[PDB]
Amino acid sequence: KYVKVQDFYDQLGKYVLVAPGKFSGTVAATDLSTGWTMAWLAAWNYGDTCPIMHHMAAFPSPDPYKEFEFVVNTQGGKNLFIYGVPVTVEDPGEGMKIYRIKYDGTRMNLQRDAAEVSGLGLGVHVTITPEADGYAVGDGQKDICAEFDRETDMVRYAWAFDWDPNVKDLKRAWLDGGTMTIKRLKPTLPGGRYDLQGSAGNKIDWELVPGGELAIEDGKVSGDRPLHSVANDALVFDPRGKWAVASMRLPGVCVVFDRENQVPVAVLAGPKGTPSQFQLVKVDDDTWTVDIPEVISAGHQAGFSPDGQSFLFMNSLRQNNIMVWDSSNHDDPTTWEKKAVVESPDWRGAYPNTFHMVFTPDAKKIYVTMWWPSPTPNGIAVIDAVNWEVLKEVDLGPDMHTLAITYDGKFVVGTLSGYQNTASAIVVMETETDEVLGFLPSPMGHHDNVIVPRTLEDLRISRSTTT
């Protein structure tokens, strides 16, 4: 007679979608086998006065439906003013919170704020270590990343990054190059803690938007110290262990760190045209530098294929493509060498902007975001990861964000977020012939989403090895 939406959910199976909602100030888990939201959480109700719920990542649980834990961070300050919502809050809080929350089989519970426990507030990407024993956050306003311990929320190590332009004027500070310093950040407060919550640390007073390097160069982004900015975005993890990679938007490079010995060991150069790497120079036991002749393009998204064998960093802005290194040699990242660039005619200038990606478990395909400012249709591009070529692009709607995949490989689940004021949805695509099955309602401006992994192997294609 009639069609039952339960038939759609029957095919997706018992996966748990989690996603935060940015200006909605909520986070929510959804049952993809029934269409229910399992639980949601409103941070205002906990006294947060700028609850911009931003990025997030879930630890694996053997049964997400009885329990799971996740990490979700917030942004604050003038970040509240930069989207199209005519916000009337005067003096909002400062965000940079890192909330630990546990779903217990009925409700979500706010465990604590890790930014308080560690001393270190960081407001961009959140990922889980491949061993599920901790997590990392990055922040492009203060240019710090750190890997924290799951059980205590204390920082295992934290790196601060600094730019020293060869030309001291914002228009040229990146294009004509400079030296980046890589600096061990050491705790300064009792108990092993930092003094870097909320805005403490900030160089620029809000996070650079997609294309937002142009803005910083044109002197349109305020802050104390924009000339020193690199805009770190993320620390993503090699699935094989040992190394974590920090992405720096403005200087177009990624830094490979030794997690156990807490040194950086290599710098990979993003733009097509430049070598595989630049030279890392140790200055002292806590200080390294790297010189860059010119920044030919800012980069964004960074991540490893599930087997560890390829590493990717996206050029965005002046170039627009995916640079791929061969990371085959687990024993020494200073050998990792460029082996492929994914290019496509429509990939010119800042838009479409490729800010997020997910591999299929066997690693032969990639789903990658194509973002544009309103009104141009946003979408997904499907990449052949064996030959490194675009297979197809699907237009979907406004403001495309992240992409997650069911662990059996079969369905891609993505979020579009209305720029915080217009249409928002969850999108489902099947990966056998890459077609959209449609949209589920989602009143939230998500800039992240995940499916709760069950095993350490599922994390290799979740929020761990890519953003």
| Binding site residues, Cu ion, CB under 5 A | 233, 447
- Work out how close the CB of 380 gets to Cu ion at its nearest, in angstroms, rounded to a whole number: 17
DSSP β-ladder status, 389-397 and 134-139: unpaired
DSSP β-ladder status, 243-248 and 253-258: antiparallel
Instruction: Catalogue the long-range contacts made by 65-68 (C-beta closer than 8 Å, 24 or more residues apart).
Output: 65/14, 65/16, 65/31, 65/38, 65/105, 66/105, 67/102, 67/103, 67/104, 67/105, 68/16, 68/29, 68/102, 68/103, 68/452
Nearer to a second copy, 30 or 127 (CB): 30
- Work out how close the CB of 467 gets to Cu ion at its nearest, in angstroms, rounded to a whole number: 5
Assess 329 for contact with a second copy (CB under 8 A). no
Among 9, 15, 59, 351, binds a second copy (CB under 8 A): 9
- Work out how close the CB of 9 gets to Cu ion at its nearest, in angstroms, rounded to a whole number: 28
Assess 373 for contact with a second copy (CB under 8 A). no
Nearer to Cu ion, 365 or 447 (CB): 447
Assess 44 for contact with a second copy (CB under 8 A). yes
Among 15, 16, 23, 450, binds a second copy (CB under 8 A): 23
Nearer to a second copy, 34 or 222 (CB): 34
Please name the residues in contact with 256: beta carbons below 8 A apart, sequence gap of 6 or more: 243, 244, 245, 264, 265, 266, 267, 268, 333, 336
Total residues contacting a second copy by CB under 8 A comes to 63
Assess 190 for contact with a second copy (CB under 8 A). no
Assess 34 for contact with a second copy (CB under 8 A). yes
- Work out how close the CB of 74 gets to a second copy at its nearest, in angstroms, rounded to a whole number: 12
**112 marked as binding residue:** yes
Q: 447 is in the binding site of which of Cu ion, a second copy, none (Cβ under 5 to 8 A by kind)?
A: Cu ion
Please name the residues in contact with 88: beta carbons below 8 A apart, sequence gap of 6 or more: none
Closest CA to 266 of 233, 237, 244, 239: 244
Assess 192 for contact with a second copy (CB under 8 A). no
Q: 233 is in the binding site of which of Cu ion, a second copy, none (Cβ under 5 to 8 A by kind)?
A: Cu ion
- Work out how close the CB of 43 gets to a second copy at its nearest, in angstroms, rounded to a whole number: 9
Site residues (CB under 8 A) for a second copy, limited to 77-106: 80, 84-85, 87-90, 106
Q: How far apart are the first and last CA of the chain?
A: 43
Among 62, 191, 345, 441, binds a second copy (CB under 8 A): 441
Among 337, 397, 434, 456, binds a second copy (CB under 8 A): 397
Closest CA to 357 of 409, 412, 316, 318: 412
Residue with tokens 């002749």: 293
> How far, in Å, CA of 428 to CA of 357, rounded?
15
Binding residues: 7, 22, 54-55, 90, 112, 125, 153, 207, 228, 233, 300, 316, 330-331, 356, 399, 401, 447
Binding residues for Cu(2+): 7, 22, 54-55, 90, 112, 125, 153, 207, 228, 233, 300, 316, 330-331, 356, 399, 401, 447
Q: Residues interacting with a second copy, by CB under 8 A?
A: 1-11, 21, 23-26, 28, 30-31, 34-40, 42, 44-47, 51, 80, 84-85, 87-90, 106-108, 397, 418, 421-426, 428, 430, 432-433, 435, 437-444
